[PDB]
Write an enzyme that holds these catalytic residues in place. Sequence first.
Site, mmCIF file in Angstrom:
data_model
loop_
_atom_site.group_PDB
_atom_site.id
_atom_site.type_symbol
_atom_site.label_atom_id
_atom_site.label_comp_id
_atom_site.label_asym_id
_atom_site.label_seq_id
_atom_site.Cartn_x
_atom_site.Cartn_y
_atom_site.Cartn_z
ATOM 1 N N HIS A 41 22.309 13.516 39.450
ATOM 2 C CA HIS A 41 22.188 14.756 40.213
ATOM 3 C C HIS A 41 23.305 14.942 41.234
ATOM 4 O O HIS A 41 23.292 15.966 41.925
ATOM 5 C CB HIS A 41 20.793 14.893 40.868
ATOM 6 C CG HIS A 41 20.558 14.035 42.081
ATOM 7 N ND1 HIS A 41 19.773 12.903 42.050
ATOM 8 C CD2 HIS A 41 20.975 14.161 43.365
ATOM 9 C CE1 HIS A 41 19.714 12.367 43.257
ATOM 10 N NE2 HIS A 41 20.442 13.107 44.071
ATOM 11 N N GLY A 143 21.131 11.045 51.613
ATOM 12 C CA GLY A 143 22.378 10.370 51.340
ATOM 13 C C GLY A 143 22.228 8.955 50.833
ATOM 14 O O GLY A 143 23.245 8.305 50.553
ATOM 15 N N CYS A 145 20.717 8.096 48.032
ATOM 16 C CA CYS A 145 20.672 8.009 46.582
ATOM 17 C C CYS A 145 21.809 7.150 46.056
ATOM 18 O O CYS A 145 22.908 7.123 46.617
ATOM 19 C CB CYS A 145 20.716 9.402 45.961
ATOM 20 S SG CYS A 145 19.141 10.172 46.243
HETATM 21 C C1 VZB Z 1 19.445 11.479 47.461
HETATM 22 O O1 VZB Z 1 20.273 11.045 48.552
HETATM 23 C C2 VZB Z 1 18.134 12.074 47.974
HETATM 24 C C3 VZB Z 1 17.329 10.979 48.680
HETATM 25 C C4 VZB Z 1 16.044 11.552 49.261
HETATM 26 C C5 VZB Z 1 16.313 12.489 50.435
HETATM 27 C C6 VZB Z 1 15.160 12.223 51.397
HETATM 28 N N1 VZB Z 1 14.675 10.895 51.039
HETATM 29 C C7 VZB Z 1 15.169 10.490 49.865
HETATM 30 O O2 VZB Z 1 14.953 9.426 49.314
HETATM 31 N N2 VZB Z 1 17.377 12.624 46.851
HETATM 32 C C8 VZB Z 1 17.146 13.928 46.733
HETATM 33 O O3 VZB Z 1 17.531 14.736 47.578
HETATM 34 C C9 VZB Z 1 16.376 14.393 45.521
HETATM 35 C C10 VZB Z 1 17.288 15.204 44.589
HETATM 36 C C11 VZB Z 1 16.806 16.655 44.662
HETATM 37 C C12 VZB Z 1 15.538 16.693 45.498
HETATM 38 N N3 VZB Z 1 15.336 15.316 45.948
HETATM 39 C C13 VZB Z 1 14.323 14.864 46.678
HETATM 40 O O4 VZB Z 1 14.227 13.689 47.029
HETATM 41 C C14 VZB Z 1 13.301 15.907 47.050
HETATM 42 O O5 VZB Z 1 12.019 15.373 46.746
HETATM 43 C C15 VZB Z 1 11.322 15.967 45.642
HETATM 44 C C16 VZB Z 1 10.405 14.957 44.944
HETATM 45 C C17 VZB Z 1 9.678 15.550 43.741
HETATM 46 C C18 VZB Z 1 9.922 17.040 43.700
HETATM 47 C C19 VZB Z 1 11.409 17.322 43.615
HETATM 48 C C20 VZB Z 1 12.243 16.457 44.545
HETATM 49 C C21 VZB Z 1 16.647 15.875 43.363
HETATM 50 C C22 VZB Z 1 15.311 15.276 42.911
HETATM 51 C C23 VZB Z 1 17.679 16.129 42.260
#
Ligand code: VZB
Lengths: 306, 306
Positions: A41, A143, A145
């Site tokens: 992503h 950040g 990820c």
């Molecule tokens: C990557 O750095 C980030 C890490 C997250 C941010 C907050 N805590 C974490 O571990 N991951 C994301 O931003 C992912 C990306 C976008 C939305 N994300 C989420 O974590 C939002 O959470 C929702 C969980 C299930 C419903 C959709 C996402 C994706 C999943 C591509």
Amino acid sequence: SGFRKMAFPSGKVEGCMVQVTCGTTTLNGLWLDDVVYCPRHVICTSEDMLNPNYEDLLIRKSNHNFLVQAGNVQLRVIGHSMQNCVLKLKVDTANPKTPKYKFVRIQPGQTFSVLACYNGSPSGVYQCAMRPNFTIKGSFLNGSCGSVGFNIDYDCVSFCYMHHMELPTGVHAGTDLEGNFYGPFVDRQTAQAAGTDTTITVNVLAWLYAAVINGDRWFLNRFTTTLNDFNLVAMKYNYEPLTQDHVDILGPLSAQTGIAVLDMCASLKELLQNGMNGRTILGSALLEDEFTPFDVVRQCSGVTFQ
Amino acid sequence: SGFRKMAFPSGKVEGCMVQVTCGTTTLNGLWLDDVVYCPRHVICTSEDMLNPNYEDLLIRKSNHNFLVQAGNVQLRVIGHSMQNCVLKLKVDTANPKTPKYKFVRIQPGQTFSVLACYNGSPSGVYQCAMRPNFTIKGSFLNGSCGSVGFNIDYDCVSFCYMHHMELPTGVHAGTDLEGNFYGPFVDRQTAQAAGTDTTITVNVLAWLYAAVINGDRWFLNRFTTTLNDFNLVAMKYNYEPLTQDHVDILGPLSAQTGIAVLDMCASLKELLQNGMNGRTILGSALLEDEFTPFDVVRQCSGVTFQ
Ligand SMILES: *[C@H](O)[C@H](C[C@@H]1CCNC1=O)NC(=O)[C@@H]1[C@@H]2[C@H](CN1C(=O)COC1CCCCC1)C2(C)C
Ligand SMILES: *[C@H](O)[C@H](C[C@@H]1CCNC1=O)NC(=O)[C@@H]1[C@@H]2[C@H](CN1C(=O)COC1CCCCC1)C2(C)C
């Protein structure tokens, strides 16, 4: 003596962490030999992430779109491909710090160390377990990820987890290093939820043995039970079933303490039925389930790694 | 989101760990530039350790008595001297992995990471606090002496602890890197005991703010209290006094959550007087006191290190 939630030394993994930037998105990559692995992503933008088609998005990308930062040295990307939910960025420099490593997929109930990273720089290290519902209870911010989870066996790093996302209850989901998600989660921004969890029974028993080894004995008793009668109690309290293989794995700890596995089950039963009555076990007022029998033996015996 | 007991990445310290053997005794040393630091009781044997005279014992020693193992490379000792309770072994090779570092002494209530080591090889990493009674609740086995505790600030390692001994209650005592013990302990085998401990109040409040940041709010209330009235409650429950400086240090966390420090004190009071009533806070059924306000801000904000 003492018992702590202990991670593996993180040096071998620190030398593999890099920063990957594509467009607006910056995350972490894992650099092994001449490949950088990262969550796919990264190629998304904030409106791509609602429901993307990653094959369509990736064919639109160029090698030069991927900016890879190995500290203060830029890595030239010379190829890219997608493997399930991870990207493999081929770079023109092999990581001279590449450890011996393996890509392994772990089972719910097993533990690993997480090196949390931001902008390719390690921030901290902590121990996690893969929950029965395939989430992990981590500590992750924007950040993070591409931070990875791992175990070390003598000199070999077994990578088992790469971080992708946070679910609405504050727990975390991600993939193995082949890009296959743990559990029924997808790297899209749609309504997803963890699903019901259970307590890892064999780990609780291991931790009770760690407590005995360390002199906490107040929860011991003269009663015993059968495996079947124990599992009726486990079911009510949302503990997962104990198998004969679990009993076998606990054998060493049973033999070292002289407490038969089924006797420790009788103690757990009384703890489940009576609570803890204001006392603590290994500094905890809850029954702890994120230590495996291996974790207990390793810590209560002193195994190192080179 | 999430909140874990997080250590610093340990790579910078791993590169400094060596094995020191003298006679029967093997322990760990810390190799920085051309000096190896280690506990002076390495020069002892099992009857020396009852009541030794270390000046007498050391003058009887030769450079060649000290066998220093840097992995599979032997280090030639070319001088030795004693500094309080540590030995400084001068070797003929500077450690090419020497990080920027400082020797600092910490205060009770502050936290640090421990890299537990055996035979010069790192075994695991975990976070500790210096208790008010100058012990630490560690995880240490035979052969762990000379393992060090540290903090990292950007790229600089501040070494604050070197391990020497276990007290009869299973807690641990050691020195700063100048060889001066934390607390009223000595490196002899005579009856020593920790002495009464207290709970680190300012850290508990910091952890309650971490819980609010992470969505745990059930313990909040509309009541408030004065600093003096709070400290009367703290005294009864064996918490240490809260000072105005503590209130000032909690200011950032107060401002981020919108919960006045003295309001959070009112919540702590009710938690102390009522217990937790079967609920948990950040996965704990006890009030946790080994996170500093700095630890909470670092984790709930994402600071890294290079
Ligand atoms: C990557 O750095 C980030 C890490 C997250 C941010 C907050 N805590 C974490 O571990 N991951 C994301 O931003 C992912 C990306 C976008 C939305 N994300 C989420 O974590 C939002 O959470 C929702 C969980 C299930 C419903 C959709 C996402 C994706 C999943 C591509
Ligand atoms: C060093 O590897 C070792 C580490 C201990 C062993 C068990 N857990 C640990 O942390 N330290 C010692 O063996 C020291 C050495 C000898 C006795 N030691 C003890 O830890 C015994 O504990 C007693 C605590 C107070 C009364 C005397 C010692 C000294 C202290 C020189």
